[PDB]
Amino acid sequence: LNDDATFWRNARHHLVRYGGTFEPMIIERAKGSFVYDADGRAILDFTSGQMSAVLGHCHPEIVSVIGEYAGKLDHLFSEMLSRPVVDLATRLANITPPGLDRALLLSTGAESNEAAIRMAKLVTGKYEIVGFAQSWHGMTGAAASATYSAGRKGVGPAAVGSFAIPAPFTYRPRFERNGAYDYLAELDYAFDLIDRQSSGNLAAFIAEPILSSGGIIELPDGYMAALKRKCEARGMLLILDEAQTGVGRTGTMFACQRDGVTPDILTLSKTLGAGLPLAAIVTSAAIEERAHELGYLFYTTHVSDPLPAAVGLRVLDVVQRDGLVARANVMGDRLRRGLLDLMERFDCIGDVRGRGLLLGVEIVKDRRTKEPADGLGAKITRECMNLGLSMNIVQLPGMGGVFRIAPPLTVSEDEIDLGLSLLGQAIERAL
Numbered sequence: 001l002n003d004d005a006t007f008w009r010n011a012r013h014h015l016v017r018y019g020g021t022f023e024p025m026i027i028e029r030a031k032g033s034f035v036y037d038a039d040g041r042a043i044l045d046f047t048s049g050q051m052s053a054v055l056g057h058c059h060p061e062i063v064s065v066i067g068e069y070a071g072k073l074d075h076l077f078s079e080m081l082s083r084p085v086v087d088l089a090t091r092l093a094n095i096t097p098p099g100l101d102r103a104l105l106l107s108t109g110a111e112s113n114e115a116a117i118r119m120a121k122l123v124t125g126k127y128e129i130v131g132f133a134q135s136w137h138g139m140t141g142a143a144a145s146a147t148y149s150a151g152r153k154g155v156g157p158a159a160v161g162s163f164a165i166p167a168p169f170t171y172r173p174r175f176e177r178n179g180a181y182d183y184l185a186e187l188d189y190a191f192d193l194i195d196r197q198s199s200g201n202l203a204a205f206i207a208e209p210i211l212s213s214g215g216i217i218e219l220p221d222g223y224m225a226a227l228k229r230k231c232e233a234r235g236m237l238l239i240l241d242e243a244q245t246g247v248g249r250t251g252t253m254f255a256c257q258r259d260g261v262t263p264d265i266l267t268l269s270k271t272l273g274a275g276l277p278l279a280a281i282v283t284s285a286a287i288e289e290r291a292h293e294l295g296y297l298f299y300t301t302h303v304s305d306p307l308p309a310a311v312g313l314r315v316l317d318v319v320q321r322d323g324l325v326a327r328a329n330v331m332g333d334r335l336r337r338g339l340l341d342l343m344e345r346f347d348c349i350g351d352v353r354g355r356g357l358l359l360g361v362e363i364v365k366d367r368r369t370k371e372p373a374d375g376l377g378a379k380i381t382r383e384c385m386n387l388g389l390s391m392n393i394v395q396l397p398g399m400g401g402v403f404r405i406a407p408p409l410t411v412s413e414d415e416i417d418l419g420l421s422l423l424g425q426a427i428e429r430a431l
Ligand SMILES: *Cc1c(COP(=O)(O)O)cnc(C)c1O
Pocket: 107, 108, 109, 110, 111, 113, 136, 137, 138, 139, 208, 212, 213, 241, 242, 243, 244, 269, 270
């Protein structure tokens, strides 16, 4: 049972709390689309762990590659190359858009964004970084300085030159022109303000193609292209953080492929490691050559470690051959349809958005007022867990609570249906 007195005693006495509250269960195993508590109760994992397990839990091919390299080639001095590293870097060059040629293999998402930001500052000779007002790029210094959805208070100044602009959000538009939401004009207006504040040192703009922590805000048609042009006109690099959108989750191998806009640097992490700590940045040959000429440094314990690289390569092999990018579209559309059906039934569902298997459901009190539903969102989430459905709701000011729904790309039709059913029941009893 989950009530193990000594487990909870040790947890309270010895864990640093780091945000939120801990779930009241003891997870003892995980397999595929489910995690199991100490009573053996299966819980449907509708967030793929921490928005990361694209192949689901304990996929046999990952188990196989992990054990193989753990016993054969594990960790190396960072100046020593090995085949998993060169193969993964080569695969990444080959599956990312033309213009992204060279990779750096790291461990975490914040870390990949730090490497990208450092590279942009170095090759531009500048230091100001612009991100979105509802962004999430990680907890470490430069990534946190460009993170606006949370965490900026109580911990002193952010990095010098940190700026944000509003993200285009079609469900809660606040910039009108000719009686309609003109998000491109909003983007111009924002950059004019950036330009006036800048010391003339804009190095890069960093962006998630779909803002996850910020409420599953998808950049609308033509926005990314317009953003890239704002960067080009200012000699800024565009860094796209695909920690959650990359590796097929949104229905294309990388979300940047949907808009056809190729960033100067692409960062990958959560979905690349599929649960394991592996991350990466990919950039063009021209930018990498210039960074090298200027002495680029990003040396870490695990940079180019063969075991993580071997895992990432197996993850890409599985996604490609089992056609998991396509599954994200088919299971994603099945899930979306089911969510829209719930929306037909429940007035509290104000919006269903997102792409592929990265969907968002926003809870409101009034669909006309779009008034956030205080407490209802939390209620629904608690009822889901009681029903055996693991969910996550994110709450930002001026917005209703948003469920972030991201099941493994290996999720079955019956599992999508089970989730939709448990969600409807949870709403029914939360009301
Ligand atoms: C998870 C996340 C990060 C941070 O990755 P960590 O491994 O937590 O440092 C970076 N970018 C996005 C968009 C993420 O959601």
